[PDB]
Structures are given as structure tokens and as C-alpha cells.
Amino acid sequence: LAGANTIIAIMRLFTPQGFLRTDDLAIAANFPRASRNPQTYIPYTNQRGTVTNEFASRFRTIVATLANVVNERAVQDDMQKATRSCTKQWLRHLETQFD
Amino acid sequence: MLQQPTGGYTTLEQFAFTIRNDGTNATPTQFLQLLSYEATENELVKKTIPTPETHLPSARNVPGNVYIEDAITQALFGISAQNVNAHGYFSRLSALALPNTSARLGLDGVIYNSETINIPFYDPAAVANFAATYAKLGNASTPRYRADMIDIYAHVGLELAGTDAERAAGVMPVKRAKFDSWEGSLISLSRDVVNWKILAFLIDLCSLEGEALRAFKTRNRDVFRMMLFIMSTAVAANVVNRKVTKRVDRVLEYIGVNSMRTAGRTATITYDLSRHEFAAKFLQLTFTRWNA
Amino acid sequence: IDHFAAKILEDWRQKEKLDKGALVEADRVIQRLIPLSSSTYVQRLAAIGALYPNEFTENVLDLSRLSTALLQLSDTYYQHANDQLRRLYRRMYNDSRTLYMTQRHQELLLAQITADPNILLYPYTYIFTTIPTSMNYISNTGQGRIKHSLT
Amino acid sequence: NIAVAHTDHLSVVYATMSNFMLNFTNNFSGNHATFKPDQYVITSPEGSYKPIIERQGETVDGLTIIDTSIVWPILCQCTYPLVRQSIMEEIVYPDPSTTLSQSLSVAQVLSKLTLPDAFINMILSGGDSVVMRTYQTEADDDLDEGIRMTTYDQYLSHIRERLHITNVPDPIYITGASTPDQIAASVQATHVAVVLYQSGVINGPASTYLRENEVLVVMPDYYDVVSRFANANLQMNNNRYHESVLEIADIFDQADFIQTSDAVRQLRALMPTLSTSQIRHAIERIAQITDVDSTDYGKLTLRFLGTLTRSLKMQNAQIRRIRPDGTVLRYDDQIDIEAFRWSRYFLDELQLRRLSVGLRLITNPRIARRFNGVRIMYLTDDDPDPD
Amino acid sequence: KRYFPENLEQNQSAARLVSAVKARASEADISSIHLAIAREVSPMFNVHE
Ligand SMILES: Nc1ncnc2c1ncn2[C@@H]1O[C@H](COP(=O)(O)OP(=O)(O)OP(=O)(O)O)[C@@H](O)[C@H]1O
Numbered sequence: 001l002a003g004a005n006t007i008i009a010i011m012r013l014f015t016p017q018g019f020l021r022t023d024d025l026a027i028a029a030n031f032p033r034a035s036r037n038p039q040t041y042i043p044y045t046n047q048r049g050t051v052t053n054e055f056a057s058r059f060r061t062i063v064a065t066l067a068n069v070v071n072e073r074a075v076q077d078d079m080q081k082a083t084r085s086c087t088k089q090w091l092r093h094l095e096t097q098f099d
Numbered sequence: 100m101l102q103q104p105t106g107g108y109t110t111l112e113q114f115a116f117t118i119r120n121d122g123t124n125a126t127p128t129q130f131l132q133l134l135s136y137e138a139t140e141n142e143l144v145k146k147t148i149p150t151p152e153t154h155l156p157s158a159r160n161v162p163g164n165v166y167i168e169d170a171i172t173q174a175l176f177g178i179s180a181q182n183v184n185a186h187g188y189f190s191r192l193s194a195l196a197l198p199n200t201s202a203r204l205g206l207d208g209v210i211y212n213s214e215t216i217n218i219p220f221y222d223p224a225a226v227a228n229f230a231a232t233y234a235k236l237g238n239a240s241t242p243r244y245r246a247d248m249i250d251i252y253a254h255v256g257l258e259l260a261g262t263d264a265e266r267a268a269g270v271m272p273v274k275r276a277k278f279d280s281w282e283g284s285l286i287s288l289s290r291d292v293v294n295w296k297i298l299a300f301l302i303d304l305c306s307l308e309g310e311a312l313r314a315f316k317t318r319n320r321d322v323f324r325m326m327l328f329i330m331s332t333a334v335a336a337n338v339v340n341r342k343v344t345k346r347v348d349r350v351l352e353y354i355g356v357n358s359m360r361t362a363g364r365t366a367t368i369t370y371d372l373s374r375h376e377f378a379a380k381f382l383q384l385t386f387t388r389w390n391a
Numbered sequence: 392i393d394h395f396a397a398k399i400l401e402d403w404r405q406k407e408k409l410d411k412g413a414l415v416e417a418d419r420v421i422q423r424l425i426p427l428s429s430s431t432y433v434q435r436l437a438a439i440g441a442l443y444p445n446e447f448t449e450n451v452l453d454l455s456r457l458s459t460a461l462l463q464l465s466d467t468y469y470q471h472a473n474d475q476l477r478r479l480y481r482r483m484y485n486d487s488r489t490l491y492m493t494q495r496h497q498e499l500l501l502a503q504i505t506a507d508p509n510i511l512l513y514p515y516t517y518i519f520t521t522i523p524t525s526m527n528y529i530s531n532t533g534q535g536r537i538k539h540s541l542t
Numbered sequence: 543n544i545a546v547a548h549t550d551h552l553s554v555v556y557a558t559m560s561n562f563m564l565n566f567t568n569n570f571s572g573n574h575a576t577f578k579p580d581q582y583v584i585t586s587p588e589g590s591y592k593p594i595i596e597r598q599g600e601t602v603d604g605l606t607i608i609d610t611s612i613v614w615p616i617l618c619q620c621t622y623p624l625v626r627q628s629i630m631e632e633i634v635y636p637d638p639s640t641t642l643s644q645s646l647s648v649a650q651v652l653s654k655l656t657l658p659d660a661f662i663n664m665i666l667s668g669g670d671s672v673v674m675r676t677y678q679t680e681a682d683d684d685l686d687e688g689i690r691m692t693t694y695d696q697y698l699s700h701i702r703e704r705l706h707i708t709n710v711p712d713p714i715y716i717t718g719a720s721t722p723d724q725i726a727a728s729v730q731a732t733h734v735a736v737v738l739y740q741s742g743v744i745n746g747p748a749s750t751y752l753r754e755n756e757v758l759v760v761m762p763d764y765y766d767v768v769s770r771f772a773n774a775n776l777q778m779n780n781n782r783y784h785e786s787v788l789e790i791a792d793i794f795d796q797a798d799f800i801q802t803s804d805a806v807r808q809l810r811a812l813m814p815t816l817s818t819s820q821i822r823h824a825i826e827r828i829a830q831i832t833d834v835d836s837t838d839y840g841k842l843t844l845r846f847l848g849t850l851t852r853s854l855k856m857q858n859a860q861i862r863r864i865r866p867d868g869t870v871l872r873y874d875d876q877i878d879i880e881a882f883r884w885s886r887y888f889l890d891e892l893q894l895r896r897l898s899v900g901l902r903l904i905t906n907p908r909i910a911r912r913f914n915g916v917r918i919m920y921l922t923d924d925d926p927d928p929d
Numbered sequence: 930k931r932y933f934p935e936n937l938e939q940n941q942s943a944a945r946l947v948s949a950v951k952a953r954a955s956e957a958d959i960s961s962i963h964l965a966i967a968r969e970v971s972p973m974f975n976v977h978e
């Protein structure tokens with residue numbers, strides 16, 4: 001959109017990280033299936049590299065974005081000013097749990 | 100006593116200077132051929148090098164036979180040397196400066212207080228010419244006599260990277276050296292250079308005169324350039340590698356620019372501040388002899 | 392930053408007078424400061440400072456917030472339409488420790504070193520030939536609307 | 543009456559306490575108007591960073607709250623040896639050793655305390671990797687050959703921050719007007735061989751440059767990618783490509799940033815696929831094996847600290863200042879201390895020098911005695927030779 | 930549970946944040962978790978809310 005870029009940006013955080021999979025085995029077995037081309041989304045895939053994980057790293061860019069969002073959140077009260085920075089530390093925690 | 104040929108001591112096969120490369124004992128010239136230089140926007144112009152001080156530092160009363168070549172080569176190319184000006188045994192070279200001194204400089208690179216048996220040594224006249232200049236390394240730390248450690252590196256660049264036209268001009272673009280590389284190539288290079296018997300080079304450099312000198316200066320240009328190269332890597336701001344289709348090019352930025360860096364790094368030898376002052380002095384003297 | 396800026400204004404005014412050929416009682420030939428260690432921004436000020444940009448003489452910059460304009464000026468020169476001025480500014484930015492100066496300044500430094508043989512002056516110094524620019528901007532800070540007569 | 547005791551006595555105490563070993567930060571500039579502490583963080587490309595200074599709400603047993611009211615006893619109910627003139631206390635000049643030793647002990651603990659983590663993270667330093675497609679631009683190209691490409695997301699998530707650490711200009715965008723020499727200059731300036739696609743069809747000489755030089759184009763997305771290139775050869779095709787991992791060590795090469803020696807490469811080759819959990823388990827094991835020596839003051843400080851280290855990532859972790867605005871700055875050659883430019887995997891110099899020799903032992907054929915593969919065959923063993 | 934870093938829960942400035950998290954974070958129960966993973970693949974007939 002012309003001027004709602006931050007909103008579209010944040011909405012992109014919701015985009016699925018998986019892949020659409022045709023139901024090959026169910027088709028071979030001639031299992032009942034209402035769709036002319038059966039398939040289901042798989043929320044995430046196998047980690048391909050030896051160490052890096054695409055899923056975790058995606059959640060990492062997500063919390064980076066969210067920390068930029070929280071950091072730009074103007075507040076008036078001092079306590080709100082605190083909870084902002086605490087919220088940022090907590091995100092930095094969540095990223096490690098997720099990884 | 101080793102006789103000095105009509106050429107230098109460097110003409111003798113005993114004093115060959117050769118870095119290891121591709122599994123063989125390569126001459127410095129055939130290493131420097133591997134080098135290639137990307138130009139950058141910056142320019143080096145060479146200022147006149149100040150005349151080295153008249154002073155020869157006192158050779159303090161030292162009973163021992165100082166290992167001088169080891170001290171110098173480790174101060175210039177040594178991987179681990181530091182506080183090189185704390186001991187100050189470089190001054191000892193001025194024991195050799197005097198006419199008819201008892202002291203001898205052995206081929207071993209040791210300054211014996213008196214001639215001793217079964218230790219070959221350089222011709223005393225040659226060493227005297229050599230000491231009359233290089234004893235001044237002994238005052239590399241004293242505040243009055245310190246060399247500039249920034250501008251001098253311009254000469255280094257010109258003497259290394261500089262094309263003959265850039266050398267005639269006295270001004271070249273700051274360059275960025277690169278070469279096909281094996282792991283630990285600069286460490287290994289510097290250690291091949293620490294083992295060089297450079298007092299042979301410096302002694303021929305100070306003793307030879309006339310055409311016999313000039314014939315030396317062409318013959319050993321690449322050697323001097325290898326010493327300059329190791330110092331350059333020692334002072335280079337950064338030393339990266341590049342993947343280049345299953346090959347690697349080591350790349351140092353930048354030739355001729357002393358970054359004054361002192362924090363150690365795996366890629367190359369590092370100068371402590373003392374090694375910087377020393378190397379600056381060494382370059383002052385050596386470039387002074389090289390351009391006369 | 393504020394210090395370097397005030398000095399750049401002093402050096403530019405002085406050079407602006409020197410280039411008019413007037414005799415000057417300058418207390419020092421290059422009035423501007425040399426960073427020995429500074430951040431990016433001071434290096435930018437050092438660079439446009441040494442350039443002696445035409446834009447100062449035209450009063451194109453506003454001195455009400457001097458350093459700001461100076462920073463902005465560097466931003467143009469960093470990506471300047473002119474190749475020579477761009478590469479010159481870049482080169483000055485990458486060697487901030489060097490003191491860039493015009494040949495005409497340099498001869499004054501020589502006269503100074505001649506009159507006082509043991510005078511100290513900053514040793515790291517490049518001598519660039521200045522790049523001419525033909526664009527004579529009109530300008531006038533200070534109150535008064537312009538009453539154009541359009542052709 | 544007390545000003546004499548502060549200025550002429552407390553001041554020398556402050557002046558010596560300033561030189562103590564562990565008092566490492568600058569404390570104050572004397573300008574309330576402008577002072578802010580320098581704000582270092584331990585950033586990693588593949589993790590979230592830790593500020594050193596943080597308002598983390600640990601109170602260190604109440605050390606962080608400040609009772610300003612403390613000035614009242616100072617001005618009004620305390621004696622000082624100088625204040626007391628006329629009796630004469632005679633000033634105390636405490637032995638250095640008692641603090642010095644303490645400092646050493648601490649410095650000696652926290653020195654080796656990180657070693658096992660540092661060693662493993664050195665090994666796996668080149669091991670992070672980006673998925674990349676390799677489209678083939680001509681007939682009879684093996685699937686490894688061809689133009690290489692990665693999504694902008696992968697570049698932003700791995701390659702970019704590592705460029706910021708490596709301290710190089712951001713790689714040039716290619717616009718299809720881009721001459722091969724410009725791409726050449728780009729890779730020369732930022733030593734990693736990477737350029738970002740921006741817009742427009744890319745000319746064929748440039749395509750030959752990107753193919754011959756293994757340059758990694760960073761496509762915004764994989765949508766009709768062949769339209770982006772001038773496929774005059776008509777061999778390159780949207781269905782014709784090969785997905786594969788590309789290790790960070792296979793693009794970066796920097797001696798103190800990312801271990802890239804062939805020995806450690808072989809070690810990574812022998813490794814099972816890993817996870818932060820497995821890596822942490824390895825580190826906990828190496829710690830379990832080397833039970834470090836500790837002076838009694840070191841055991842004391844260790845229990846004071848005194849537990850978890852597990853949270854922070856160390857994949858290519860560096861010390862780098864943040865801006866107060868929150869952005870992580872590049873290493874400034876004229877500000878940040880030189881030691882911060884490359885954490886040397888947080889290993890000591892001698893440890894590196896030895897480490898190289900160890901790589902020489904590891905890569906040696908004689909110790910390479912795990913054998914792979916076998917041959918079932920039904921021969922008689924007439925003349926038994928193992929070889 | 931692992932919702933907060935040490936020692937953010939103890940911290941008095943974090944109180945509003947911590948109460949926020951605690952108001953969201955449900956106790957784990959195998960049946961409910963399994964139901965979520967299974968709902969992902971099971972057909973829906975009555976529309977979810
Ligand atoms: N005026 C300038 N002079 C020299 N280099 C510059 C200049 N502006 C930017 N750079 C280079 O770009 C980097 C800064 O990027 P960028 O310009 O996006 O942000 P900035 O520092 O705020 O500058 P600007 O205000 O021009 O945006 C610096 O590392 C510097 O090398």
C-alpha cells in the first residue's frame with residue numbers, strides 16, 4: 001500500500017514457512033479425497049545445512065522486526081518506558097528458546 | 100675471516116635467500132612474480148628521508164657475544180618478538196664501528212668481543228662500514244633519534260608495488276597486493292625470511308661501492324622487496340582471503356600505508372610499538388643507503 | 392564537530408581572502424584542524440574543509456547551523472556529479488590524518504620554514520591541484536524578497 | 543573542614559583505584575551535558591546480541607540502588623586521618639598484593655572459563671550455510687556449474703551481518719547495465735564474491751562473469767528468474783537448476799573471523815548434522831573433561847557469578863558498539879580498541895599458534911585410520927596381506 | 930516453565946510485561962497440545978473461531 005508499509009511489513013511476519021505437499025501416498029492407495037488434486041501444507045521442512053536452521057533464523061528476523069517495532073513505540077509513562085526495554089530483552093530470550 | 104668477493108658476500112651460495120614455495124626453495128624474485136596489485140583512489144608520494152643521525156649509541160660494556168642477526172631479523176619479521184628496545188643490544192654494533200677493534204662479527208650473526216678459533220667472520224673493514232650505519236638501530240627507541248614511522252612506508256610501496264614509471268615519478272597509487280595462496284602463507288613467508296642471513300645483505304650494501312655496488316642493487320632488489328613485503332604485511336590494516344573458483348587469493352590492504360596496528364592477528368606477524376619504531380629506523384637507514 | 396566546523400569557517404574565510412591577492416596577517420597558513428583520531432563525521436568535515444568548495448564563496452551554505460550544512464555538503468561531494476571532485480573528496484576522506492593543501496598554501500609554508508628553519512609544522516601533507524567549477528550560484532542570506540523580471 | 547581530607551587524600555585513592563586491572567571502562571568525561579558510556583555488545587550473526595551494559599534488573603545484592611543521602615554522614619558525621627590534623631593517625635598505604643592477586647585470580651578464571659565454548663565455536667565458525675540454486679547457462683554443464691543465486695532473505699539473514707563484521711562496502715546492485723568490470727570492482731572491494739540483483743535483464747558478458755567467477759547473485763525472489771538474464775544462449779531455464787547448501791566458509795575467508803583451514807573443513811565433513819542443543823552438549827562435555835585449576839579466590843568469584851553461560855550464541859560472535867539508537871555499529875578503526883576488531887574465537891595467541899600444528903597432526907595420513915567401505919567377495923585367504 | 934530469562938521475573942520494572950506473559954501463557958497438557966497438532970491436519974466441518 002502507498003503509505004501503510006510498516007503494516008504490510010509486520011503482516012509478512014505471518015507468512016507460513018512450510019511447503020505445499022501433494023498427497024502422493026494417499027493417492028497411490030486410492031484413499032478418499034475430496035480435492036481433484038489432493039495436497040496439504042506442511043508447516044516446516046527438514047533442516048538442510050549441517051548447523052543453520054531456516055525456521056529458527058526466520059523467527060530471529062521476526063523478533064528483530066518486533067524489537068524494532070517495540071523500540072519505536074512512543075510512550076509517555078516511565079513505567080511504560082521500562083516495560084518497553086524489558087519486552088525487548090524478553091524477545092531476545094524467546095529467540096533462544098525457539099532456536 | 101671470510102674474504103669478500105668483488106661482488107658481495109651475497110654472491111656466495113652460502114648466503115642464498117630463498118622462500119619456500121610450491122614445495123621448492125624459490126628465489127624471492129619468483130615469489131614476487133606471483134604478486135599482483137589492485138589500485139585504489141589514494142596516492143602515495145615519497146617525501147625525502149631525513150638524514151640518519153650522526154650519533155652512534157654506546158656499545159655498553161657487555162661481556163657476552165651478542166646474537167645480533169637473530170635480534171634484528173626477529174625484530175623485523177619475528178612472529179612473537181616484542182619489547183625489542185628494552186634490552187637495547189643493537190647498540191653493540193658500534194663495537195664493530197671502531198678501526199682495529201678486537202671484536203668480530205661472525206657469519207653466525209654473533210658479535211664476538213674478540214676473534215676466536217673456528218668461527219668464520221666477515222672482513223672487519225666491511226663490518227665497520229656496516230656498523231657505521233646500522234649501529235644507529237641502537238638509538239631507534241631514544242626520543243631524539245626516532246624515525247618517522249608513517250611517511251617512510253611510501254618508499255616501501257614504491258620499492259615493492261611500484262612500476263618503473265611510478266618509481267621514476269616518485270608517486271604511485273596506493274595498492275592492494277594479492278597472490279595465489281596456501282594456508283598460513285604469510286607466517287611461513289616471514290619465517291622463511293627470519294632465517295635469512297641478512298647481515299650478508301646489509302654488509303654488502305654498506306661496503307660495496309662503484310659499479311660493483313650498483314650491480315648488487317639490481318641483483319638483490321627482489322630480496323630487499325621480500326623483506327619490505329614481510330614488513331608490509333606486518334603493518335597492513337587488513338589481510339583477507341578471496342575464494343576464486345576452488346583457489347584462494349591472499350590480499351593485503353594496503354601496500355605503502357602503515358596502519359599503526361598493534362593488536363595481534365593470526366594471518367601475519369604484528370609489530371608492538373617498539374617493533375614499529377625499530378622497523379621505521381631500519382627503513383630509514385636502509386633506504387638511505389639504497390638511494391645514493 | 393563544532394570545533395572542526397568553526398575552524399573550517401576560519402580557514403575558508405582566510406583562503407577566500409588569500410585568493411583575492413590581498414596581503415594577510417594570518418597567524419597560521421592553514422587555519423583548519425587535522426583529525427588524528429575522530430569518527431566518520433569529523434572525517435567528512437575534514438574532507439570538505441580541505442576541498443575549499445566553491446559553494447562557500449557563493450554563500451550557498453547556511454552558517455546558522457554551520458556543521459549541519461557542512462555535513463550535507465560532504466554528502467553531495469561523496470556522490471558528486473563531477474568525477475574529479477568526487478574522487479578527491481573520497482581520497483581526502485580515506486586519509487584524514489594527512490593535511491591536504493593547495494600548492495599556493497604550500498609555498499607559504501615554505502617561506503615560513505625558510506624564515507624559521509626550526510619551525511614545526513604538520514609533516515603528513517598532500518598537495519592537490521584545485522578543481523575549477525564554472526557554476527556561479529547567486530545567493531544572499533538576509534531579509535528581502537527577490538522581485539524577478541522573467542524573460 | 544573535611545575538604546582537606548577529600549581533596550588531598552581521597553583523591554590519591556581514586557587516582558590509584560583508576561589504575562587497578564579490572565577497572566577497565568572509562569567512568570565519566572566530566573561533561574554531564576554529553577556523556578554516555580560506550581556501549582559494547584557481544585553480537586553474533588546467527589543469534590541475538592548481548593549488551594554488556596543493560597538494565598537487566600539484577601541488583602547485585604542491592605549494589606545498583608543509590609542512596610544519595612550518604613553525603614550527610616560524609617559532611618557531618620565522619621572523621622578522616624587528615625581531618626584529625628592535634629592527633630596524628632599517620633596515613634595507611636595498603637599492600638598492592640591483596641587486590642592485585644584478587645584481580646589476577648579473577649582474570650585467570652574468566653580467561654579460561656570460556657575456552658571449551660570458544661574452541662567448538664571456532665570449529666563450527668565456517669559451518670553456517672545458505673541455501674542456493676545454481677541455474678545452468680549452457681549445455682553439458684554439471685549441476686555444480688552455472689550461475690549461483692540466493693534469496694534476499696538468506697543474504698540478509700547470514701551474509702549481510704557478516705559483511706558488516708568483516709567491515710566492507712555493501713555489495714553492488716546489478717541493473718543489467720552492469721559491465722563485468724563493475725562486478726569485478728565490487729567483489730574486489732568486498733572480498734566475498736556476492737552481488738545483489740536489482741532490476742532489468744542482465745547482459746550476457748555479465749552472465750559469463752558471474753558464471754566463470756562463481757559470483758553469488760542475490761535474487762529478491764525466485765519468480766521467472768530466467769527473464770532476469772539475457773539468455774541469448776537459450777540454455778538457461780526456470781526448471782533447470784540445482785539447489786544446494788553453501789557454507790559460510792565457502793564464501794568468506796578471514797583468518798581470525800572464520801576458521802577456513804582444510805583440516806577443520808574435513809572435520810566438519812565428518813560431523814553429523816547438528817543443532818544448538820548438540821553443540822551445547824559438546825561444549826558441556828569438553829568442560830566436563832578439562833576441570834580447570836582455580837585459586838580459592840577464583841572458586842569464590844566463580845560461585846559469586848555464578849552459573850549459566852548457555853544462552854548467548856557465539857557462532858561468529860564479536861565485540862561491537864551499538865549506537866544508542868540501537869543499531870550495531872561496524873568496528874571503527876579510530877574509536878573501538880584494536881583488540882575488538884576480531885575476537886579470535888576468544889582464544890589466546892599461543893593457543894592459535896599451537897592450534898595450527900594440531901591441524902597438521904589431524905590432517906596427517908598416518909593417524910587417519912578409520913576406514914570406510916568394504917568388499918564382500920568369496921576368495922580363499924592363501925597369502926594374508928592386510929593391504 | 931521457561932518464559933523468562935533470569936532474572937527478569939524478579940525485576941520490578943518487568944512487572945507489567947511479566948503479568949502480560951502470564952496472562953497469555955497456558956499450562957502444558959498433552960491432550961491439548963496433541964489436539965492442536967492434529968487439528969492442523971484433520972478436516973474442519975463446523976467452522977472454527
Ligand atoms: N559524506 C560522506 N563522506 C564519506 N563517506 C560517506 C558519506 N556518507 C556516507 N558515507 C559512507 O557510507 C557509510 C554510511 O552510510 P549512510 O550514508 O547510509 O549513512 P550515514 O552515515 O548517516 O550517512 P548519510 O547521512 O549520508 O546517510 C559510511 O561508512 C561511509 O563510509
Ligand SMILES: [Mg+2]
Nearest residue numbers: 401418419422
Ligand atoms: Mg587562533
